[PDB]
Design a binder for this molecule. Structure first.
Ligand code: U5P
Ligand code: U5P
Lengths: 379, 379
């Protein structure tokens, strides 16, 4: 009976909780977490994470949602179990820690072998086909998540698309759950085989890194040649095949996904001839070298870093040349970061820095704009 | 008086004639060409080139348009002279032949020094700033053309954008001429400085080559790993920041612009640190090596090339390994191309070829689809 199902969420971070609150509008959702304090909060309709829509829906909407620390209570009778536990890929060792996902697969297989597991956690390419073969089970399907931390429920209410890594009626019924709870209508939906679904986010994020790296190389050329980067970029981006988005120069692509995913994809190309995949990684190092060299050519005695992630790579290079860096970051509470002073008073920071670097311009740097170096054009 | 101006077109290829017919709907246009036969045809309202809309407008619309071989008749009293003469960049020697453009600048400067020249021909980055300085003149402005041969007047009637490489009222009046004749309304219009305008097409075409090269590397990986490329590409391209266009795998980017422009841009980066610009060129060689290797692994005794431009690079590599190639190309009338037989009978071609390669699938290859190798997914 697909009319009213039980869906268990294993993992209460933004991915699991966003999916759980979305589905609890129409089905029975039970959230499993190992931490009793998190379970008690959820049962009191308090979100353990910061996400405005998740907190609003938990507090104000009638959701058939509850939490528990009991695995048997959580998995028994579940039609689907969404696995959204933490995973991490380390590019230095090429190790992808999937232990939390494998622990859930172990527990569901033992407690309810008829449940269909949907992995939303990030996993390595080929993970699902391999784990099914290893354990001799069939009830595991991967589905990528395209959510932004802080707007995770909003992104599930208005998704770019839904992709489920199995071609079957049970995969389509899970996609239907995601569409039923959404506000956006006629959401693009794609069903693929397993390993293909697991490769989508690495190829999508690596294209975004390539696009930023390309506009950054155009910007390196414009600076080197004394040209106006904004004029060139706006003219280029008026071609509708290119578009006016994701084209703002910076000190390099950063954030929590692009640096690691581009490297993870390159490792997957160890036996595949390529030049672009490897260049996306190299390009970022070259761009940071160019930006650092431009700053160092101004012969500053102290460089001020306004806000703290590619700017970290710039700071590293400036310090390697023996020039002190001071940091302005109101969110940090320590007085030192990577051996550099964190200055609390903005006016003291502005006065001492000979060049203030910022990945993006800010209103509060307006009065010292003359000594601000930023390649931001569009805000 | 901008109400009714005289605009001379120097060059009657698709760029000059498209611009001339567009502007002749509202102003006086005089086309100058060195070839008397071309002038006589134009005066009889016959187009010397193949372009449906150009021929329809010349024959059916009231255009204030005429042609002449007399430079004095053509340039005298002109408010603007559009320079659309042939130019060519040779990547092997890094030589950009701009002789025809410099000859027009010479003639207009002597005959009518008050005319404002608009260069639409492709020229090297920095050309206009340098020629103005060299000759001591101010009346030359570059404006990129974004036209497709065969639909050149259509692309001027519905342009992606208009970019004029000078910030001035006389530049804006020329943009107004282009907008007045167009069918599309509220056309995006950008005014830039000179060298910036000259760099736009190289950066736009190189992004398109990068995009094709990236989807081709994704395709190399999918083939190498036994995965369905279409599933991965459709999932990736459903991200609206990426889009479902210009994402069809092929044997490499080709055509008349991308191979040369990517190399021209790389030459311009001789003193600018980069990895992506150089990788776009290298990637195409690597992709052609991958495609050739995939074909050669099938141990064919004869490879059939269905239609003739990246497939040429594949043919070169197959022949380097000592395997004969036969070519099916109805448009060619010779029986040999680069030392390979051109076969006229499609059934004879199909029977003799052990593997038939085609950059895109075609209906007439449907009955031999089993031995057809193509990476086309979308048509
Ligand atoms: O136009 C852009 C868009 C993104 N980024 C960088 O790419 C990374 C991913 O951006 P986002 O997708 O998280 O916004 C971030 O480091 C962001 O600053 C840019 O440099 N320019
Ligand atoms: O999705 C695409 C789009 C373009 N191209 C290739 O890129 C070059 C430029 O295409 P166009 O802009 O002339 O259509 C041509 O060789 C074309 O086959 C592809 O391989 N795949």
């Amino acid at each position: 009976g697909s009319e009213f199902m039980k869906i268990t969420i294993s993992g209460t971070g933004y991915v699991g909780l966003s999916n759980g609150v979305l589905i609890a509008q129409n089905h029975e959702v039970v959230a499993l977490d190992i931490v009793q304090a998190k379970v008690d909060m959820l049962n009191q309709k308090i979100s353990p994470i910061v996400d405005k829509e998740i907190q609003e829906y938990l507090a104000e909407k009638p959701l058939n949602f509850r939490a528990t620390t009991d695995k048997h209570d959580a998995y028994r009778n579940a039609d689907y179990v969404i696995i959204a536990t933490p995973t991490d890929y380390d590019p230095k060792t090429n190790y992808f820690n999937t232990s939390t996902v494998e622990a859930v697969i172990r527990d569901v297989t033992e407690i309810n072998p008829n449940a269909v597991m949907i992995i939303k956690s990030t996993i390595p390419v080929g993970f699902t086909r391999d784990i099914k073969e290893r354990l001799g089970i069939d009830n595991v399907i991967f589905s990528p998540e395209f959510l932004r931390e802080g707007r995770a429920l909003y992104d599930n209410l208005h998704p770019s698309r839904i992709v489920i890594g199995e071609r079957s009626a049970r995969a389509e019924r899970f996609a239907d759950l995601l569409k039923e709870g959404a506000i956006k209508q006629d959401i693009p939906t794609l069903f693929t085989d397993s390993t293909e679904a697991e490769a989508i986010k690495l190829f999508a994020n690596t294209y975004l890194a390539l696009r930023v790296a390309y506009f950054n190389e155009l910007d390196s050329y414009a600076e080197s040649q004394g040209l106006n980067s904004k004029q060139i970029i706006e003219g280029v981006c008026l071609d509708p095949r290119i578009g006016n988005h994701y084209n703002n120069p910076s000190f390099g692509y950063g954030g929590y996904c692009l640096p690691k995913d581009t490297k993870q994809l390159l490792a997957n190309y160890e036996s595949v001839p390529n030049n672009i995949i490897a260049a996306i990684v190299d390009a970022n190092r070259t761009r940071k070298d160019f930006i650092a060299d431009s700053i160092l050519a101004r012969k500053p005695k102290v460089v001020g870093v306004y806000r703290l992630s590619s700017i970290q790579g710039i700071m590293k290079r400036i310090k390697a040349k023996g020039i002190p860096v001071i940091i302005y970051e109101p969110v940090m509470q320590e007085d030192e970061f990577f051996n550099s002073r964190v200055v609390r008073d903005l006016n003291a920071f502005k006065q001492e820095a000979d060049v203030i670097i910022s990945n993006r311009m800010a209103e509060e740097l307006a009065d010292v704009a003359d000594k601000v170096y930023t390649r931001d054009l569009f805000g």
